[PDB]
């Protein structure tokens, strides 16, 4: 009851008689005017490009005229003045992976429900019995637990770019890069909450990890770099570039891949690797977007390549020192492990993996002349 025009005979008879004999236009695309990155227009691009109503005076905009309501003082709703970078067209960027909210929440949902199944399997199998108690109650609880705040600060460094980004495709990538960082922060806390349930006496409260983050020496310099990247940078691109192509590319990768992922297996910890496997899959998914935006689109722009490479070199040089200082303080944590876990030869080797991965994937793209040996020697100054 309530009659509907598709199925009600009287109403549908009226609609059907008013219809044309064929579509009044044969071009049934949508986004047919968008220049496709890959030969055939994709659904990602059709549903996303030119959703942002920019006028032609913000590079690449299709509309005209001023904004109808500006900030008190005259600041525009989106303007060229919110970033140092310049381009021929802000809509050039494409997410390799082509994510538009439905594929993105689809994948993450698969990861949530598989985490749930994994956890129920692990606790029922009793695998905590093989895990080293000093690693569990100290390195997971306090030191991994403290890294949470580093991911949360890096998430938060995205708020302004979410407001200030200059096109649909950059804003949707930016938002997914930040949501994955709050996800990691939440997964480190989920791990501590699982452990409190299966291990008598484990306290899931964040008091101990928080104190470590705010008052410990190991994550000092990391927290100060995060505080800086989050709240002292007002250029939205400087934030996303310096978080993703400098700070997290060296420090975050060292901690996740080269400390906890390398050493937790040695202590019978297959739990933390399950969550760091999510963190490294996300790091690598984001990297592809970061490289397309900053290197293929800005770094290689037909008019502004030399300009934009100069500003990105500038920002790499600005944030490489806080990053090296973050890395340097973190070397103090090796002194806390049980003897025989690691030696200087393994650590030096892991440092060079991080530094050379960064030079290949990031620094070389903009001709930043980085010297691996001096960067690792600088970090090695904090090891003992």
């Amino acid at each position: 009851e309530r009659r509907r025009g598709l199925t009600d005979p009287e109403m549908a008879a009226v609609i059907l008689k008013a219809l044309p004999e064929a579509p009044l236009d044969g071009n049934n695309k949508m986004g047919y005017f968008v220049t496709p990155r890959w030969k055939r227009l994709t659904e990602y691009e059709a549903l996303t490009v030119y959703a942002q109503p920019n006028a032609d005076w913000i590079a690449g905009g299709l509309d005209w005229g001023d904004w109808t309501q500006k900030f008190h003082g005259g600041r525009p709703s989106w303007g060229n003045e919110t970033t140092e970078l310049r381009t021929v067209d802000w809509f050039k960027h494409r997410d390799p992976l082509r994510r538009w909210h439905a594929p993105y929440v689809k994948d993450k949902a698969e990861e949530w429900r598989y985490t749930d199944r994994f956890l129920q399997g692990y606790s029922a199998d009793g695998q905590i019995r093989a895990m080293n108690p000093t690693w569990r109650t100290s390195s997971c609880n306090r030191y991994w637990g403290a890294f949470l705040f580093n991911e949360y600060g890096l998430f938060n460094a995205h708020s302004q770019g979410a407001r200030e980004a200059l096109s649909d495709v950059t804003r949707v990538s930016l938002a997914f890069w930040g949501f994955d960082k709050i996800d990691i922060a939440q997964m480190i806390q989920l791990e501590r909450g699982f452990l409190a349930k299966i291990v008598p006496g484990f306290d899931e409260s964040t008091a101990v990890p928080k104190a470590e983050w705010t008052n410990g020496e190991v994550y000092k310099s990391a927290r100060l770099a995060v505080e800086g990247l989050w709240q002292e940078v007002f250029d939205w691109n400087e934030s996303a570039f310096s978080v993703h192509a400098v700070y997290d590319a060296l420090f975050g990768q060292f901690v996740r891949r080269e400390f906890f992922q390398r050493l937790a297996p040695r202590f019978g910890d297959n739990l933390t690797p399950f969550f760091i496997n999510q963190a490294q899959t996300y790091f690598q998914i984001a990297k592809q977007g970061v490289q397309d935006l900053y290197y293929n689109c800005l770094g290689d722009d037909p008019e502004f390549s030399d300009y934009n490479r100069t500003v990105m070199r500038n920002w790499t040089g600005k944030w490489l020192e806080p990053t090296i200082a973050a890395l340097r303080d973190f070397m103090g944590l090796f002194a806390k492990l049980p003897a025989g876990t690691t030696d200087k030869e393994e650590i030096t080797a892991s440092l060079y993996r991080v530094v050379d991965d960064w030079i290949e994937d990031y620094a070389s793209a903009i001709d930043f002349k980085a010297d691996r040996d001096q960067i690792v020697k600088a970090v090695l100054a904090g090891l003992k």
């Binding site: 005209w64 003082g73 600041r75 060229n80 140092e84 310049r86 007002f234 500003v311 040089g317």
Partner: protein
């Protein structure tokens, strides 16, 4: 004519091409924002094209600033060689001392006409936005509906055509 492509835009592209030095490019950009920008502009003759022409002038000045300045100066000085933090702190002390909303709007406009990127580093400029906007709004939104329209028209100094 043409929305997006016309003789006015062509003429300015042609003169923006030819600014060969930073100090000349930045002089032109500053003078352009006094002449064609905000309700206090010197004429509305370029109203249909000034936002676009301004962007093009910005591109040129940004490019020349980056070639002329070293890395610390690109981060910390204005295109006219002033210390950005000093200009920002002086303007905020000025704004904070503003007697009323009338004084306040002229300080905040004026700052934007003079210092908008690429003249000031955007990190300094949007911190200017943040502080400056708070005080202008606190002054304007206090007892917002209390002056009758007949009086507010006169305070703004409008010519009533109706």
């Amino acid at each position: 004519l043409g929305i997006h492509s016309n003789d006015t835009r062509d003429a300015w592209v042609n003169k923006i091409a030819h600014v060969n030095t930073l100090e000349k490019a930045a002089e032109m950009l500053k003078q352009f924002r006094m002449d064609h920008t905000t309700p206090f502009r010197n004429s509305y003759e370029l109203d249909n094209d000034y936002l676009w022409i301004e962007a093009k002038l910005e591109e040129k000045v940004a490019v020349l600033k980056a070639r002329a300045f070293n890395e610390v100066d690109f981060r910390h000085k204005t295109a006219f060689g002033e210390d950005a933090k000093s200009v920002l702190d002086g303007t905020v002390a000025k704004m904070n001392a503003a007697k009323d909303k009338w004084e306040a709007e002229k300080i905040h406009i004026g700052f934007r006409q003079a210092y908008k990127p690429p003249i000031m580093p955007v990190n300094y400029f949007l911190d200017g936005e943040r502080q400056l906007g708070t005080r202008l709004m606190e002054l304007r939104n206090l007892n917002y509906y209390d002056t009758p329209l007949e009086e507010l028209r006169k305070q703004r100094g409008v010519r009533v055509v109706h």
